[PDB]
């Protein structure tokens, strides 16, 4: 990591260590694959959003939810 430029960085180079709940989260998207660390990043209802790991189970059970998917179509939102 030689990042000695500003402090806005544009992939993940430091994941949320805490176990946050998918409903203190509103949305997320992936950072750009061009990135050689990219990572999937949650956005909370305050702004604030962080990256994450995609092999933590939180984030895979989080996705299933703010996916427009879900499983079978129940209520939007």
């Not at 000695?4 to 949305?27: G, V």
């Not at 933590?56 to 209520?75: A, F, G, N, P, Y």
């Amino acid at each position: 990591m030689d990042r000695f430029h500003a402090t806005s960085a544009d992939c993940c180079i430091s994941y949320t260590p805490r176990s946050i709940p998918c409903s203190l989260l509103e949305s997320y998207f992936e950072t750009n694959s061009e990135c050689s660390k990219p990572g999937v990043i949650f956005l909370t209802k305050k702004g604030r959003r962080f990256c994450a790991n995609p092999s933590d189970k939180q984030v895979q059970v989080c996705m299933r939810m703010l996916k427009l998917d879900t499983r079978i179509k129940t209520r939007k939102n």
